[PDB]
Protein backbone atom coordinates (compact mmCIF):
# COMPACT_ATOMS: atom_id res chain seq x y z
CA UNK A 1 0.00 0.00 0.00
CA UNK A 2 1.28 3.77 -1.04
CA UNK A 3 3.80 2.62 -2.97
CA UNK A 4 2.89 3.44 -6.56
CA UNK A 5 2.85 6.93 -7.82
CA UNK A 6 2.13 5.88 -11.63
CA UNK A 7 3.94 6.13 -15.14
CA UNK A 8 6.68 9.49 -13.80
CA UNK A 9 7.41 7.31 -10.85
CA UNK A 10 6.65 3.90 -9.21
CA UNK A 11 7.88 1.30 -7.06
CA UNK A 12 7.24 -2.81 -6.43
CA UNK A 13 9.00 -3.78 -3.55
CA UNK A 14 7.94 -0.58 -1.57
CA UNK A 15 4.29 -1.23 -1.92
CA UNK A 16 4.62 -4.95 -1.83
CA UNK A 17 6.59 -4.97 1.62
CA UNK A 18 4.46 -2.88 3.32
CA UNK A 19 1.30 -5.30 2.00
CA UNK A 20 3.51 -7.94 4.24
CA UNK A 21 4.00 -5.93 7.01
CA UNK A 22 0.35 -6.72 7.87
CA UNK A 23 -0.96 -10.33 8.41
CA UNK A 24 -3.13 -12.65 6.63
CA UNK A 25 -2.32 -10.98 3.08
CA UNK A 26 0.40 -12.22 0.82
CA UNK A 27 1.23 -9.46 -1.87
CA UNK A 28 0.36 -6.31 -3.88
CA UNK A 29 -0.22 -4.54 -7.09
CA UNK A 30 -0.09 -1.22 -8.57
CA UNK A 31 -4.11 -0.33 -9.52
CA UNK A 32 -5.88 2.19 -11.52
CA UNK A 33 -3.43 2.38 -14.08
CA UNK A 34 -0.75 2.01 -11.91
CA UNK A 35 -1.49 4.99 -10.16
CA UNK A 36 -3.23 3.21 -7.37
CA UNK A 37 -1.83 0.73 -4.23
CA UNK A 38 -3.99 -1.85 -2.98
CA UNK A 39 -3.02 -4.60 -0.70
CA UNK A 40 -4.53 -9.16 -0.88
Excluded: L, T
Excluded at 1 to 21: I, R, V
Amino acid sequence: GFGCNGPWDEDDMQCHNHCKSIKGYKGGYCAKGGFVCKCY
